[PDB]
């Protein structure tokens, strides 16, 4: 947690792409020092994890950006649709299940639900 | 044979009831044991080994 | 046998790096009930099925 | 009796829940009673023990000793109090592990936001006592 997420929200998506490449370089210099010399035990750990932290903030900013790009799209990208289940994505909608023929509409309209109470 | 009904004071007799005829029934100790044996195995839950075991 | 496919050598390398004792710092960990690696494999006694 | 069917009275599941408790639950299970001087201020019965807590030992060999908590270890459930020690052979003094139930907190540490956590339990206890007072009023 050497690189904090608070600073990564300020950077842009392509600015996080360059940061992950720059942090990958420093990890290669750390893996050099681990082989040749000693290192503090979690230096490779920390630099590996803030590469992941930069890339996560990159992904989280990119999901937010791509959603507002293709929000009012006819077909949104599959990334931005909710991954329910293949069966649940192929389910009929509640509007489609409520679809009934004209005779069922007229009958429910002409004979609606009654609210009543009985007593003997 | 009349029984007292006590208050929560525990000493004052409030009513004096007659004994109900249930409590004057001569006890058949064998019959209460025979019924207790079958009543005890009303909540008897099953046990078995696994059929593959 | 000095001629092998890419899959054979990767499986042979994975069998080789696996075949090592418990690192000695693990014997000082609490709750470490393992004293020696019981899954050690010797090349003459135990065969690998890498064909 | 326990009338909640969804909680276990099972010994096996309660014992497994104790030894495979996670670290958040193991902190709660390592609670310790307060003194009466702390309970007049805070009100709650006990609180989870922490490092730098002043503690009087209530049971065991060190019973009646006072000292600060210098080490809590959640796995194996042991609180190590300053001035509750035993020597090794090489003269090295080791703190002796005491269960948290055998310790009573004399002075609560309040440094690392713990005064917030004490006041959160204190206020929720005070608020829940107000609801039970109104319900018994009605």
């Amino acid at each position: 947690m050497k690189i904090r997420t608070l600073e990564l929200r300020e950077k842009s998506v392509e600015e996080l792409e360059t940061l992950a490449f720059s942090l990958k370089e420093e990890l290669l210099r750390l893996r050099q020092q681990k082989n040749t010399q000693t290192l503090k035990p979690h230096e490779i750990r920390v630099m590996r994890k803030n590469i992941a932290r930069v890339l996560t903030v990159r992904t989280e900013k990119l999901y937010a950006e791509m959603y507002e790009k293709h929000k009012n799209d006819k077909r949104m990208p599959k990334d931005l649709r909710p991954r329910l289940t293949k069966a649940k994505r192929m389910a009929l909608t509640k509007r489609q299940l409520n679809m009934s023929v004209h005779s069922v509409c007229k009958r429910r309209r002409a004979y609606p639900r009654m609210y009543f109470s009985y007593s003997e | 044979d009349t029984v007292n009904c006590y208050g929560i004071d525990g000493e004052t007799v409030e009513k004096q009831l007659e004994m109900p005829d249930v409590l004057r029934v001569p006890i058949r100790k064998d019959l209460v044991e025979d019924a207790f044996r079958c009543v005890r195995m009303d909540n008897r839950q099953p046990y078995a080994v696994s059929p593959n075991a | 046998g000095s001629r092998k496919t890419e899959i054979i050598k990767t499986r042979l390398s994975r069998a080789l790096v696996r075949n090592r004792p418990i690192p000695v710092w693990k014997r000082r960990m609490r709750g470490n009930t393992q004293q020696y690696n019981m899954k050690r494999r010797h090349w003459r006694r135990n065969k690998l099925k890498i064909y | 009796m326990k009338f909640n069917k969804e909680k276990t009275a099972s010994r096996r599941k309660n014992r497994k829940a104790h030894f495979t408790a996670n670290s958040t639950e193991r902190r709660i299970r390592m609670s310790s009673p307060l003194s009466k001087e702390l309970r007049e201020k805070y009100g709650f019965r006990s609180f989870p023990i922490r490092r730098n807590d002043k503690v009087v030992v209530m049971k065991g060999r060190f019973k009646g000793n006072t000292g600060t908590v210098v080490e809590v270890r959640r796995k194996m459930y042991k609180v190590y109090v300053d001035s509750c020690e035993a020597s090794k052979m090489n003269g090295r003094k080791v703190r002796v592990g005491i269960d948290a139930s055998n310790l009573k907190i004399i002075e609560l540490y309040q440094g690392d936001g713990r005064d917030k956590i004490l006041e959160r339990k204190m206020n929720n206890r005070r608020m829940q006592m107000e609801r039970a007072a109104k319900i018994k009023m009605e």
């Binding site: 937010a64 931005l80 | - | 499986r11 | -």
Partner: protein, 89 residues
């Protein structure tokens, strides 16, 4: 002849690594795995009642299924970043 002498000639290896199931059961001549039946599309009908216990579903990592159990438990709310964006509009 029949026994100890004939075992010296057993230096062919007929069943090699299957690319689908990873057992050493893919035959070279037959070009079919004896365990899982690759390259048939459906899995081979397992030859024993215990073979499902060794090789079936749940005996592996269940990488997608453990995720979809966790999403189903929470109500399939899905991606946490996109969840707040659909909630705002």
């Amino acid at each position: 002849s029949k026994g100890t002498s004939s075992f010296g000639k057993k230096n062919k290896r007929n069943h090699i690594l299957c690319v689908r199931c990873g057992s050493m059961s893919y035959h070279k001549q037959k070009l079919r795995c004896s365990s899982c039946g690759y390259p048939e599309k459906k899995l081979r009908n397992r030859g024993s009642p215990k073979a499902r216990r060794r090789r079936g579903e749940g005996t592996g990592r269940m990488r997608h299924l453990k995720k979809v159990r966790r999403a189903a438990r929470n109500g399939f709310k899905g991606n946490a970043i996109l969840r707040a964006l659909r909630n705002a509009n």
